[PDB]
Amino acid sequence: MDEKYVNSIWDLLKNAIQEIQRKNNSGLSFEELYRNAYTMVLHKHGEKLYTGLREVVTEHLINKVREDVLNSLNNNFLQTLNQAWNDHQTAMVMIRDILMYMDRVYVQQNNVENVYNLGLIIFRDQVVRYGCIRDHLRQTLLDMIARERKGEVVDRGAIRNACQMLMILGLEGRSVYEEDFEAPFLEMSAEFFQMESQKFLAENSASVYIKKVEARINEEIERVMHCLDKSTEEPIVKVVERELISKHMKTIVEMENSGLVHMLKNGKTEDLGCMYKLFSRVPNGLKTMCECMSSYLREQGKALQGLDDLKSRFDRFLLESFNNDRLFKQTIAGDFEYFLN
């Protein structure tokens, strides 16, 4: 009907939306509010409604919610942030329901986000990614993971709660989680692991090192399961595989008074079998072991009736420690065919 009557309807819904926002769901009639929203969209006033919706939410989250999270930065930040997120989710569900006819008719037909998805975008842009908040959340989640790794006891629950939220604001996508948390996390992790690798090489045996690497891989998988998105397992492991294994491949195998050659000489089968299973992860991993072996085996066979003893000893390793691998088999065989000439 007339411009004034339409503004009557919108004033009614605006007050209802604000009441919901203020946690006052009870006093409201679902059919009255739904009919008013319906009457607007039915009489082609959907844009007025949608534009109005985008305002009432934007204003609430900027003036009340952003402020709350900011005022509680150095006083229970993540908690003040999850409560902000929960209160929002709860409100946006009720807002989406009174405006259900707009979601089904207008939103579809006019290439715009749906009420809940719009609510998510505003919370994302105005609260979770507000620079000061965006940064303080990134530094918070990372300082916790760094403290945890360095021994301290931290709240994995608050960490999973923020990660779920970061994932959800991605709008059925990891866009927000990836750049706001994952990428900075992976970066600080690699810097940690690189330093960790330097300590363990300087004071632990190759067997101990290889064990400590497996232990680190297990810890990082165990961390993802308990407080990050399941999709971070492959990235973080590859960062452990890169910094601990891949970057120090020749260093590990060649370790003096330890390593492949000493393991082959002192016959420590399971120890070099452990090396095989770890070096089978990284590219050129097994190659390095073959190269180290071929260098030694050719130098040992060059010294050699007793080559039946050599063949049998390496046959045992290949079958037990090297899982009868095609590459190792060909390498051992290649070195034996080399002695003929």
Add this chain to the structure above:
Amino acid sequence: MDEKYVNSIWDLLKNAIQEIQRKNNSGLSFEELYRNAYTMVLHKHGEKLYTGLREVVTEHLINKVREDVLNSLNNNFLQTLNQAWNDHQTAMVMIRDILMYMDRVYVQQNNVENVYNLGLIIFRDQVVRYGCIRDHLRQTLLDMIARERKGEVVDRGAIRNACQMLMILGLEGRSVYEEDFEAPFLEMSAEFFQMESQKFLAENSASVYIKKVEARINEEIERVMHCLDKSTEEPIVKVVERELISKHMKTIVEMENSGLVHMLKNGKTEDLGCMYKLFSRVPNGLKTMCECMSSYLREQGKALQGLDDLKSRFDRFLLESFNNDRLFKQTIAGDFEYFLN
């Protein structure tokens, strides 16, 4: 379980059945009573239950219900009888429900009547057909219909209520209604109509008589619709058709200073058209009119240039009063072909 435990269960159900009978449905737990009935049939004690059921009902209707109906014979009989019937129907529904598992499992498998059908048989045999009751109900329904016919104002409602009941006790069949009410009703009706016919012939014109017959047919159809079973329409009409039309066919047509010949002579078309529509009901009905006509038409044509006037006059009757009937057409034609010889 043991004989005593089974008798514990049955004593519980017997009391529940009697409480229901006494109008005390409320205090009872449906699942407790149903489980007890179930436990008996499940443990193959169905016959004890069924035999017990047949007793508790038989005893109630003989000792309490039959007595009530008898004590109120000359004091609101039909009402005391419908209330007996309603209270029964109501109880038997609740009895059938607590014993639902017996109806589905035992009753089926052991070639016996179902709880509700058994209840109907006992009410039928012990109350509605108890000789003194059987007779007083038959005399009641008939004295009413006789009073109604003779002018008086009677309760068609009480009459339909008893007829529905009589029909229902037929066990999806009219066996009880047919012999307890219909047959005596049809008999007393024929005796009435035979006397009615004698009065109307002795003092009314053939046209008036024919009208009074149609009026009687309509009254008797109107009576069946309002207070008897719809299935009594064909029998009672055939009794009106037999006693009023069929038995006095030649008498009506030949009525002096009235009737077919006088209607044909004085040219009263619709009047003999009325006769046609009534005599078309009964067998040999139209034959009698043709016979009466052929006797007259042959005597009139035997008297006869003016036979073009005769042909045209009878052509008009045949088309208007006789609905251009094949039998009448052939009869008129036959009589005309007769004059040639």
Add this chain to the structure above:
Amino acid sequence: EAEDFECSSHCSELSWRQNEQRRQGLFCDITLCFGGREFRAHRSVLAAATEYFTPLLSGQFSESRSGRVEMRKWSSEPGPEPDTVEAVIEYMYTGRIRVSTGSVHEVLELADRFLLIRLKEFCGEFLKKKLHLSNCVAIHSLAHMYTLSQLALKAADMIRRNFHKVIQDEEFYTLPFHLIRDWLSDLEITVDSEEVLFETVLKWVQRNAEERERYFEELFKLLRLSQMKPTYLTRHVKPERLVANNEVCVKLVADAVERHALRA
């Protein structure tokens, strides 16, 4: 080993038996009022039938505590015909409905309002068949109001092709302002001359003069005065009291005559 069972008949029966309950009032949870008659129904069924009833009956709003829902403000004064309401409620139970040539309007109202999308779909596929030369203007106003986009296009195309004749029948002069506005600014419309469009603006505005006069100025702006003959603009357009009153359009009708003289 195990085995799965499927009673095909089951759910068809279950739904029908629940309807039979509703009709007797058996186990009815909620009471649906449409005019000051009311229809008793089952919260479980209604909520299962459409996304609408779930938040209503949930527990976050007055209706859950009420145990009654006042369905108000319908196109029909005391609400839709009870027969059409019972028909649609039954559909929510059974998924079976008969839509008459009359029923379809009120059915589409409820179907659309109560978010019964597969029933709304049907009405759309129904009217698409019942679409004709007379049917087209009334069906377009339906398809446009109840967002039946596929049907709106087929109804619009038949109006664009037969515009010259649709403006002859009174059916068009019923249309709301926003639809007149959208038709005048529609370019694929097929009329004999642009001068006829003015005669239709003047005809339509005259009907509900008291409420419709406000729009005229906006509607006159839509008129492509360039494609109109200068003889017509000077003798028929300029002297109209409706155009002589507003000074915004006397300037536009003056520039239009100015432009034609300037075309030489």
Add this chain to the structure above:
Amino acid sequence: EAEDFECSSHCSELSWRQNEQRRQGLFCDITLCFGGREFRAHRSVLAAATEYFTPLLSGQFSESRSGRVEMRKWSSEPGPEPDTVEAVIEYMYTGRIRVSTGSVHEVLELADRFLLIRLKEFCGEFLKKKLHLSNCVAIHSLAHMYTLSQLALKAADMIRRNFHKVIQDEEFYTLPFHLIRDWLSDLEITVDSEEVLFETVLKWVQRNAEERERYFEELFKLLRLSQMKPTYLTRHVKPERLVANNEVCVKLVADAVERHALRA
């Protein structure tokens, strides 16, 4: 003219959405307790699923006012397994259930008790397939208890054909008195000699001696002592303490020996 609509998918969806409600407790009317766990459900659905729930929930009995139903006295001590109860309740909503080699016993209990005849039917057609040499005595005791007449006959016939071997396995010595009674008086049974039947009466009665001794006299009367060898009756039947105690059977064992001497 009019047109009828049928949303084929509809009732299948409606039922499933109502189950999804029940699982969340949404709009649940009644609470069904089976042991001191309880299952929340919908009065409308339950009543629609079976003739049982209609009088219960109607309003003529305590349960309607209660809003809770205490399902007591089941073959399993604290009632059937909750998984089997949820399975059957879901079936009342959806008409879909999976019956395991284990499930079938408790499923048939509930199906039969709660008058779910098409589910009971399935269990009957299921066990008919799973019927074997070991399965036959246990399946007969089921089919006999839960009035599965078609199955009882097929199970009985396999027991009558393989009686001589069924009395070897302990499975038979579980059977209740009324079934022993009915087997002894069954004429189409196939055993080597009538003397073996006595050895099975003595074996079965010995098991739960304290409760089973009462029956022995009735069971001994069923024994066709005419078809037994006089050497056996004098040396093995007559000296049994179980037969020497009752004086009713010492007379019957005496007439039996009397009849054999009288046959010469």
